[PDB]
Write an enzyme that holds these catalytic residues in place. Structure first.
Site, short mmCIF file in Angstrom:
data_model
loop_
_atom_site.label_atom_id
_atom_site.label_comp_id
_atom_site.label_asym_id
_atom_site.label_seq_id
_atom_site.Cartn_x
_atom_site.Cartn_y
_atom_site.Cartn_z
N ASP A 188 5.89 71.80 58.25
CA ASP A 188 6.77 70.79 58.95
C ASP A 188 8.26 71.54 58.82
O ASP A 188 8.50 72.76 59.03
CB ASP A 188 6.60 69.56 58.75
CG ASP A 188 7.01 68.44 59.94
OD1 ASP A 188 8.30 68.22 60.14
OD2 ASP A 188 6.11 67.76 60.21
N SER A 194 2.09 61.57 64.02
CA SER A 194 2.52 62.35 62.80
C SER A 194 2.15 61.84 61.75
O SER A 194 2.02 62.27 60.71
CB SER A 194 4.14 62.56 62.90
OG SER A 194 4.40 63.41 64.07
N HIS A 251 11.21 64.75 58.87
CA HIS A 251 9.82 64.41 59.15
C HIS A 251 8.65 64.97 58.32
O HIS A 251 7.75 64.38 58.07
CB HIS A 251 9.55 65.30 60.78
CG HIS A 251 8.39 65.05 61.46
ND1 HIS A 251 7.40 65.76 61.65
CD2 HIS A 251 8.19 64.04 62.17
CE1 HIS A 251 6.27 65.29 62.25
NE2 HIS A 251 6.99 64.15 62.87
N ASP A 290 12.04 78.21 48.89
CA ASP A 290 12.64 76.77 48.70
C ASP A 290 12.60 76.00 50.02
O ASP A 290 13.42 76.41 50.74
CB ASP A 290 13.97 76.91 48.25
CG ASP A 290 14.44 75.56 47.96
OD1 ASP A 290 14.01 74.51 48.39
OD2 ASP A 290 15.75 75.59 47.48
CA LIG Z 1 15.31 77.71 51.92
#
Ligand SMILES: [Ca+2]
Ligand SMILES: [Ca+2]
Ligand SMILES: [Ca+2]
Ligand SMILES: [Cl-]
Ligand code: NA
Ligand code: NA
Ligand code: NA
Ligand code: NA
EC number: 3.4.21.75
Lengths: 5, 473
Positions: B45, B260, B86, B73
């Site tokens: 996502d 979702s 989201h 990350d």
């Molecule tokens: Ca990053």
């Protein structure tokens, strides 16, 4: 394209 | 004696448990001892707030990556509009920490949870493929709540790299047992969209999951299609409750909505199931969903009984997921036989469509050959056709057992003159049927216009096995 969902 | 979570918003998680029986029967799985320990789920996502007070305890950097910025990350990009919330909302549905005084709980509240930041940028085929293919011997379950545009006129699916990622995932992922790809079926209901026009949901390699409202109705945003496999609860009207989860900026929300929310809840139930039997293959998991999902008290006007006695709807597939039943059936499950594929080229000449076309063919489903199928899984009608206004078409496929699958309903906004180019319309509704006998394809013009076109190819592709059937329901 691509959509949230 | 099992003690249910004490989290402050757990009483608001109506879909996890209740006296009322309108729930996913998750507490029953928890009480059997399954909370997700040892299972790894990744949310593909817009990122994951890995320091969220209800995610940090379960966060797994090995289940995470930032494909948009090419770094490890997946922290979301913060904006005044909180656009990149989201993925964090999806993650909390799977694996929010339990019994920690914060928000609610995940379905699999002891699973490990990661996120792939891949929507916050240009979503190329390569981006999709690197996400679907992330760490496939560590991540067990992938959850995706995104796809092609829900404008009711798009026909689109994975390009070459993404499709290769699916095939590599199910073939070599998870120690050869196959990556489990969970997909939300779409939010195009207002546009009369069809989730068979979305190649991600229409894929046999994904478990496509639709939604039901709290009162058991088909939500406004729901897309109907034959490729959907099952359903979880999500949002509805403003008198119906919504989904409780982790929100961006270390907050808790009670208003997560749409399909979702259904894919992550399904992913959590599948995580509990894989804890109950780590040896389940990607196909085993779909069999379990078909056998255990529950139609009861889901309202639809198209419920039909298939050839082996199971109720199926284009809005809901086989019905609501049932977590207690899934984990119970998984424990002594016998691995299904290797997947067979029987390819039947149906036409001997092109066929003008006109107002209505019916194509009948009696097949033997590779009788006498190693790919003989007596127990169907997925079936595809791979169609190549021209037509002047695609959305006026309705397409149905009838199996030898009499099960009528809607491959394509009318799409009023689809004015395309581009037709279908070997589009592999898929149905789950004939699962476990014997596919020998007469198949019927119906193509009709649902409008009064004098439309025109030609069907030039119809490949019936049957997947399945030749052993192990149950007595019909
Ligand atoms: Ca990053
Ligand atoms: Ca919590
Ligand atoms: Ca759609
Ligand atoms: Cl194949
Ligand atoms: Na394999
Ligand atoms: Na699918
Ligand atoms: Na038959
Ligand atoms: Na017949």
């Amino acid at each position: 394209x691509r959509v949230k969902g | 004696v099992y003690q249910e979570p004490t989290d402050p918003k757990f009483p608001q998680q109506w879909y996890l448990s209740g006296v009322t029986q309108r729930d996913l029967n998750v507490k029953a799985a928890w009480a059997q001892g399954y909370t997700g320990h040892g299972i790894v789920v990744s949310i593909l996502d817009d990122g994951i707030e890995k320091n969220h007070p209800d995610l940090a305890g379960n966060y797994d950097p090995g289940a995470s990556f930032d494909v948009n910025d090419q770094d490890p990350d997946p922290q979301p990009r913060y904006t005044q509009m909180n656009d990149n919330r989201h993925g964090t909302r999806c993650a909390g549905e799977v694996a929010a920490v339990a019994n920690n005084g914060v928000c609610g709980v995940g379905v699999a509240y002891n699973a490990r949870i990661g996120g792939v930041r891949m929507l916050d940028g240009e979503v190329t085929d390569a981006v999709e493929a690197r996400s679907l293919g992330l760490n496939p011997n560590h991540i067990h379950i992938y959850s995706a709540s995104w796809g092609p545009e829900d404008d009711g006129k798009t026909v689109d699916g994975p390009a070459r790299l993404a499709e290769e990622a699916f095939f590599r995932g199910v073939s070599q992922g998870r120690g050869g047992l196959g990556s489990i790809f969970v997909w939300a079926s779409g939010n195009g209901g207002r546009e009369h969209d069809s989730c068979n026009c979305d190649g991600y949901t229409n894929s046999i390699y994904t478990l496509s999951i639709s939604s039901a409202t709290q009162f058991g109705n088909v939500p406004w945003y729901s897309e109907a299609c034959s490729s959907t496999l099952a359903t979880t609860y999500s949002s509805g009207n403003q008198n119906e409750k919504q989904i409780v989860t982790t929100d961006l900026r270390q907050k808790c929300t009670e208003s997560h909505t749409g399909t979702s929310a259904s894919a992550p809840l399904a992913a959590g139930i599948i995580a509990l199931t894989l804890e109950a039997n780590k040896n389940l293959t990607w196909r085993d998991m779909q069999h379990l969903v078909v056998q255990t999902s529950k139609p009861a008290h889901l309202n639809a006007n198209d419920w039909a009984t298939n050839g082996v006695g199971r109720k199926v709807s284009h809005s809901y597939g086989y019905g609501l997921l049932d977590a207690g039943a899934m984990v119970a059936l998984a424990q002594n499950w016998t691995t299904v036989a290797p997947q067979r594929k029987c390819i039947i080229d149906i036409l001997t000449e092109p066929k003008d469509i006109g107002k209505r076309l019916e194509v009948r063919k009696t097949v033997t489903a590779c009788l006498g050959e190693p790919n003989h199928i007596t127990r169907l899984e997925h079936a595809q009608a791979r169609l190549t056709l021209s037509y002047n206004r695609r959305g006026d078409l309705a397409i149905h496929l009838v199996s030898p057992m009499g099960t009528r699958s809607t491959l394509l309903a009318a799409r009023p906004h689809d004015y395309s003159a581009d037709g279908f180019n070997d589009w592999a319309f898929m149905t789950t509704h004939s699962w476990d049927e014997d596919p020998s006998g007469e198949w019927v394809l119906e193509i009709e013009n649902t409008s009064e216009a004098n439309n025109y076109g030609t069907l030039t190819k119809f490949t019936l592709v049957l997947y399945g096995t030749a052993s192990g059937s149950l007595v019909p329901r």
